[PDB]
Structures are given as C-alpha cells and as structure tokens.
Design a protein around this ligand. Structure first.
Ligand SMILES: [Zn+2]
Ligand SMILES: [Zn+2]
Ligand SMILES: [Zn+2]
Ligand SMILES: [Zn+2]
Lengths: 286, 290, 290, 286
C-alpha cells in the first residue's frame, strides 16, 4: 500500500516523483519510539530520501545525514533504487509545543546550525557527494535547497507527516517536482505560481490523495506515469555481522563481558534490532 | 577567436555545449612544453573541463583531476563559469609510438587504473564532488561516463586535439550533448546515428567549423544559441604570491639562497610561469621576514 | 598542563611519543558540541594526529581525514610540528547505546567502509600522501595500520578519551611506540606482552599518569626524553577571513543579507567560531566591494 | 648473477641495501636502444628503483616517474618486492659530450626542471605517494633527496652505470644507506665522513666489488646480511591485454587499420615488445 511513482509532465519539461510512505514511517516510529516531533522529522527525512533514492539506478544507493544542532541530533537515512529505506534519529525523545501555525515544531527539534549531506555510492572508488547548510530546519525546504544548489536542478520538494494522538503515524507522503533545462522562461512561471497556490502537502495527504493525485493537483495536469514501485522500510542487518562488531573488540573485552554476565548485546542503530550473544556464542571466539 | 557556446536543440529536449580551444591548448603546450601525446591528454582534459565549467554560473568554479597511473602522472584542470581554464600535467614530456589506429596513444599516457574526479565550489557552504573510475583512458569516453554517472541522462562528450610535428597545437575543440527527459526515440536514434556516423571533432575544427557548426553537424539541426563566451588559459598567480611564500621560509633559508645562488627563481606549477628574485630582492625579503 | 613528549627507549631501538590532551579535546567538544560517542571519535583522532604531527619538524604540517561512511560523516584534523591541532567532524551530535563491552561505540559513529588519509606539507615542493583502508573504526587500530603500512616497522598507537555524563571530557591521551631495526626478540616480546597486558590509556591519564609515566608503564623502562612541548587546539581563522569572503559575494548578495536579516553571522567550520557582522559593518562591505 | 642484499650495520642503527644490476640494465639498453647517456640515466633509475622496491613487502609495488625537462623526457620505473623491474625512457636517443669530469652528462639529458615522484600501490584504495623537485639531475642525489625530504629518512643513495664503447653496459650497481632514529649524534658523523671519503660507486663497480663488498667499503665494517634475492628485468605484458588497447579504439578504427593494411600493431612502452594483429585477429572483434 506504500508506493512511489516516477512521472513526467509538460511534455517532458517536468520530471516528477511522488510517494505514500505511511507504513514505512510507522515502522520507523515503532522501532525507534520517537516522540511526535521526532516522528515528523524522521518521516519527512525518510520520505525525501526515498524519492532521492528513486533517482538512482541498479544497485546504487545513497545516504542522507542531517545534523542541525537541535536536540534530535543527527538524522541518517539510507535509500536505494529499489525504494528500500532504513533511517534513524539520534535522540527519539524530543517534545516541544506546537509552533504558531499549530504544527509539530520540526525546525526546533532539528536546528539550523549544521549540514544536509547526500552521499551516492556507485562502487568502491565511485561516488557523488553534495552538502549544503540547513537553512530551514523543516526539512522539505532543506532538501529543495540541496537539489537547487548542490545538484543544480531547479526543484520543489514537499514532504508531510501527520501524527495521531496515540503517537502513531496517520499519513506520510511527498513529492519532488523538477524543471528541465528546456523549460521556457514563462512555463516556469506557470508551474511556480501553481505550486505557490496549491494546498500544502500535509493537507493533501490529510484528504487521502494518492501519489498520482498529488502530482496532478500540484502540477495542474495529469502526469505521464513512467513507473510505479512498492517501497518499504528495510534493514539487512543480521547477527552474523554483529559478530564482526564483537570480534572487533577482541578476545579480552570478550572474555570479560561474560565472566561477568555470561552474555553481551549489540544494537543496530538503523532498525533498533538487538542481538544477544550467549555465553557459548561469546566463547566461539575468545 | 577561441570561444564556447551554450545551446538547446529539438525544442529544448537536447542541451548542448561546444568550444574551439586551439589557442588555449596551444598556450598550455607552450607553457608546459608538452610532447605530442601529453598535449593531446592535456588539451582533451582542458576542453572537457572548460565545457563542464560552462554549466556553472557566477563565481562558481571546479577542478578536474585525472589520475590513471600512466607516465603523464596527474592531469589537473581548474575551470570557472567565465570561460577561464588553467591546467597542468605532472610530467609533460610524455610520448609514444602511435597507437594501432595511427593516432596519439592518450590512453597509454594517462593509464587505465585510477579515477576522474570533479570537485565544484558552488559558493560559501554549498559543495559537490564526483569521482568515477577511468574506463577508457582516451578521456572523451571517461568524461562521458562521468556525466552519465552524475546526471543519468544519455550524454556524449567529444574532445579532440591535433598536434603539429613541431609540437605546437594545430587544432583543439569539443562538444557535449545531453538528452533530457521526453526526447522521443526518433530523435535519440537520429542523434546516436549522427554521433556514431560523423567526423572527428579536431578535424571539424581544422576544417574551420565554428562551435555552432559543429553542433549543427552533430545534432542534424541548427541549435538554438543561448550564450557565447570568449575563453582562455589563465592562471591568477603573480610574483607577489611567490614573494609571500619565500618570506615564509625565514632568514636562514633565504640567506642560503643568496649565498649559494645569488638569486632565486620561483615557478608556478599550474602554469609554469617563472619569477626571478634578484640578490637585492632576496636581501629585502630576508630583512623583512621576522 | 596538556603536553607531549618525544622519546627513545631500549638504547635507541624504540622510538616513542606520548601526550595528555584532555584540555585540547575538551576545547574541541565545547566548540563543536559533540555528543559522547562523537567526542571519543574526535578526540582519538585529534590525539593521534597531534602525535603524527610531532614527527614533523619546523613549519611542516599535516592533515588527517577519516571517512568511514558512518553517521559522524568525515573527521578532519590538521596538526603541525609545534603541537597545535584543529579538528572537526561533519555531524557532532552523534551517539548510540554503549557497545557490547560497555564502552562508546566509536566504530559505529565512524563506519567501517572508507579510508584514513594523511597529507603532509613538508615545504615548497616536497609532498607526501598516504591512504589506507579503515580496518577497525575504533581509530587506534586504524592509525596503527596506517603506521605499519607507511613505515613497515612494528607500531602501536594507543589513544583514549573518557567523557562525563554532562558531555564534557574527563580525560584524553595517547601514545605511539615503534620498534626500529635491531630490536632483539627479547625486547619485542617484552613490549608486545606489556602492550597486550596493561591498562587503558584514558584511565592511565585519569589516574594522573604523565606522558612520561605512561611510556614507562607501556615500555617496561623509563624512556629517554628527547623533547617536551606544550600542545593546544588552535584555529588561525579571524573575522577578517570571513569579511574577505563576504566582500567576495558582491553588492547584491550583501544587500540581501542586510534587507532580510539586518546582519550576518559567519561560522568557521574547523573550530565553529562565530563572527557577527552588524548592519553597519555589512553596509561598509557592500559599499567597499566592486 | 644480478642480485640485491638487505643489511644492517652498527648494531641496527644503519639499515642498508645494495645491488648489482648489470644484466637488467643491459636488458633495458637492448630493448630500448638507448644511446650511452640515456643508458646511464635509465640504469641509474632502474637500480635506485629496485632498491626502493626491495623496501616493500608481499605483493606491494611502486612506480618512479622522473621528468626534468631535458631531452630524454620522462623516465618511468616499476619495481616490486620480488626485485622485478620494468623501466623505459621517453627518448632513448640522447647524445652529449662527456662532462668536465669525463662522465656521461646525465643531468643535461634529464634536466633539473621537474619532479621525481614515487607511488606505492598497496591495494585498490591504499597508496603512499611522495614527490620532490629534481635538484641534481644526476639521479642518485635526487633519490637521496626523495628519501631525506619526502620520506623523511636520513639516507645516502649511490648508483653507477659504466657503458662500453659498443654501447652495451659493462657494470651497474648501487647502494642505499639509512640512519635509524636511534643513531647518536656522533656515530652519524663517523658514517657521514666515511661516506664522503670512500670512492664513488662507479669506481667501486669498476673494480668488481659485489653488493656485500660495496656495503663493507662504504660502511667501514662488514654488514649483517638479512636477505639476498635475485633481481631481473621483467614485464608481464601479453598480446591478450593489448587486445584491450585495440578493443578500446572500437569497431570503426578497427575495421580501418585493416581494410587498408590487413593488420595492426601495438607496442609496450616498458619493454618494447611489439604485438601484431593479423586480419583474422582484428576481425575477431569488429
Ligand atoms: Zn538493522
Ligand atoms: Zn600560475
Ligand atoms: Zn576557525
Ligand atoms: Zn612489456
């Protein structure tokens, strides 16, 4: 039921993407136990990251790191060309009152003193990196700035997350609209005004609009859908793997951890799975 | 008379660039005293860099570095948004027998085990880097691979340099063509055919085709010109830069210079400009420095 | 009271370095507002860099860059031959649950897919670079691997940082031991035993062991001291540097600053020093710039 | 009969290397057809490079590139931990009169406006590089400067090549002496003076001294020999390999080269083996 669409509009002058990510954002919330404001920052990042990741091909993948000096600390999302995302926030426990407009105060959680970086991993010696300063802190506008100023593509990013009173996620989705080099300086203005006039993405997702519908409303025309794909929260961590974490400590600290408890545990930061090594298992190296 | 153009074609679905860089590549050859194979590697790199630079705006700028492990060492080119390039290679006097096609063996000079990287300065606190493997060593195809990797639109970079027996440059130029979204398949196979179907770019320049004409030839239609700009080899070094560096050595090292040599020649590695500090200049610096 | 020593031991067959860097790592923590795990990565890197720097002479200097792919991003440290370090991490507010040994999970912050590189400026036209894979992520072992790769003598780098619950630094220090040619096997197994047999370096510092005492403890004999030096966190940035950068933006961008903000804050990314340009200062710059 | 020794002296305070490279330098001369002055530059580079290469371990390897602006152009040598060297000069045809001292005028051939670089390849993302300016042009003293100033190890390099009237090589060999960190400022002076007083390496190789003997004369004591190994000119190029060169041109220039000659050739720059592709062979791609 979560998915992403790749689209064109205006006869190939607009390259567009849209997604519905309610289930994956709910899974992020549950795994990390984020408080509402942190959920909003997490889901906004996850959704934007997924759509960046969909711009990739094949086995290529990317990582977004945001750390604006606010109490949530660093937010990291991995996304790939298959629409698999894993993401965490460094401090899930962030509470503030609503802002003046009655929305979760994401910019106070994130902070605006630091950077948004995107690292694309194409192979062992092949990568593309980009970095800008966080100028908004609401995340959607920071991703816009990344696209416009580091990637130098005229773009508009909208991401929205609605949090239920019980702290679960009601809805999440977003879009990215990009104007291609060919676009005549006049059709640019038709789209820029219609974007500036349509309802914010949070309102659109509140009404239950699908990704195609969101693109149509925001664009003022039905888009050519190039591809739809399913998307999911996914983290490939496993116990064998955390072994290497534990191996990396050695035979000393390993002989300890035990002789003192008869066990040890390690935690995946992306998905919060916990791995317990029993006494027998720990002995299998020491 | 060297210059570059920015262009669209096929109702804005093709974005294109082209340049004639004979004079600037000749300046590089002259400054660094490259041998033919190395001039070809240097001038291909310069021309490709200039065109990437043309995709920037304002005061932005970029640096290309090729390090394939070959005898030429590193090839480094700075390019800004205003049509100015400076470039050097580690080892300018690099040359070989002609390759099996009777052309300059650029791949042998460059090496095929290493990377091509592009680092962009896009303003205070806006940063972009890319790095790809060298896949060819002939450079045109490497830049194509960098562009396709970077922007994931079909791209084609052509660059050429013809060198005279006296080691001077006879011609240099290039183009970049990129097919944006919504390019229909008729235009693709038009363009791809033309591409893998038309003459070498350095002979088009030698024939005296303009940048505009080259795009017409390659594209199959007259391009829409968005901008033309003069271009040149330029390094902003000056004697003052080197004076400052000599000062930073301290009195002792300077006095060594005066005593064993009576003078000092400082050389910019980017453009090989040579600056001479007389005994008296150096005495002034020894006495100025703390 | 932070300082570093240079030493020999076992009749000159062992070359050694040690430092107490509590205060400088505390300055880095404070400047950048690192969270515990990131302070440990930052301070380990700083201390290792300082000691590498101590192997240099004169005005020479070096830059360490760690890029393992982890959440902290890049860790960059400049170190000179005069005991001065500046360093930053991309993302200071990085932290996790304790690792399986109940210690700060530095490897998780750093990542284990990337490189550690060292670029040395050894004078006008003398250059040295090294780069190795990250093998651990815990940093001590990575620096050891860099040194063994570089000089091919048995080496050991220890570095530690203890952080308080309030995020301040309680202790930081380190050592490097290298076994030169002709070290007999009795001294090797002496040293290797001691090494893989003695307490953590950050607790030795907390206990209030000096650098000298730490080398004694690790080596099994009192070292011969060759040099002691004061050390510190220092970044030579100043408001003037940023003024110059603002000037370089042009009148228009500056006027935007004045109009939308009434002022401008410029921040050094190396040391996070914050410089404030009042409306009037900015008016001065807008009018000065061409 | 060519070989290299690894040594210590002065109870581990001196780390030393020496080699006899007459046969490999003769092979370089024959392959490239160097004229005498070029032979001297080539052999000096080969011998120094071999001894640098012996400092390496395992499968690690290095490349020395020298290009001083003189008529010989770029000199490149590869050397590995096994003492395999391959090396060429860009212009083998360099003639000058003898210098004032009656020796081949290597510095006029090489030139002193450019750099000596050494790249050590430890793996795909692992390398050490060093570069200095060429300050002598005679090569031995440039290698000394590389070791002293880039690698920061107090060192003395001696390399010598004697060329026969018939242009073949009569002798070639060299040494490197390094002073270790422990060396007391007084035993440094005993060695520095004895080095400054002994006969130049060309004279020593003229008299037929082996590597061990050269170390003993230059050191003033018999060295501890740690290892001896055989050394050779070796280049692993093959026809299959040059295929990739030719493949890298494509199917067009390939269809040509032929339809016009019925063949094509490519040449290894390091060893000057020539590879001929027949009409049938060229067709096996086009
Ligand atoms: Zn996980
Ligand atoms: Zn210059
Ligand atoms: Zn600073
Ligand atoms: Zn060969």
């Amino acid at each position: 039921m979560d998915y992403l669409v790749k689209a064109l509009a205006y006869d190939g002058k607009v390259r567009a993407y849209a997604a519905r990510t309610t289930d994956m954002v709910n899974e992020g919330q549950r795994r990390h136990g984020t408080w509402p404001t942190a959920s909003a920052a997490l889901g906004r990042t996850m959704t934007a990251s997924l759509m960046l990741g969909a711009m990739l091909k094949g086995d290529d993948k990317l990582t977004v790191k945001i750390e604006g000096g606010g109490p949530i600390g660093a937010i990291v999302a991995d996304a790939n060309a298959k629409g698999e995302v894993r993401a965490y926030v460094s401090n899930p426990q962030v509470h503030f009152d609503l802002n003046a407009a009655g929305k979760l105060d994401v910019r106070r959680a994130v902070g605006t003193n630091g950077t948004l970086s995107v690292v694309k991993d194409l192979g062992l010696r092949e990568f593309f990196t980009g970095q800008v300063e966080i100028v908004s802190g609401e995340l959607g506008d920071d991703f816009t700035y990344y696209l416009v100023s580091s990637e130098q593509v005229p773009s508009s990013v909208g991401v929205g997350v609605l949090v239920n009173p019980d702290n679960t996620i009601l809805a999440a989705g977003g879009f990215i609209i990009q104007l291609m080099p060919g676009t005549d300086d006049e059709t640019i203005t038709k789209i820029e005004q219609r974007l500036s006039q349509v309802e914010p993405i949070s309102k659109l997702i509140q009404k239950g609009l699908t990704p195609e519908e969101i693109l149509e409303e925001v664009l003022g025309e039905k888009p050519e859908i190039l591809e739809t794909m399913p998307v999911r929260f996914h983290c490939p961590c496993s116990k064998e793997r955390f072994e290497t974490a534990i191996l990396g400590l050695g035979k000393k600290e390993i002989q300890d951890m035990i002789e003192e408890d008869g066990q040890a545990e390690a935690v995946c930061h992306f998905c919060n799975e916990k791995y317990l090594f029993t006494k027998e298992e720990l002995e299998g190296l020491r």
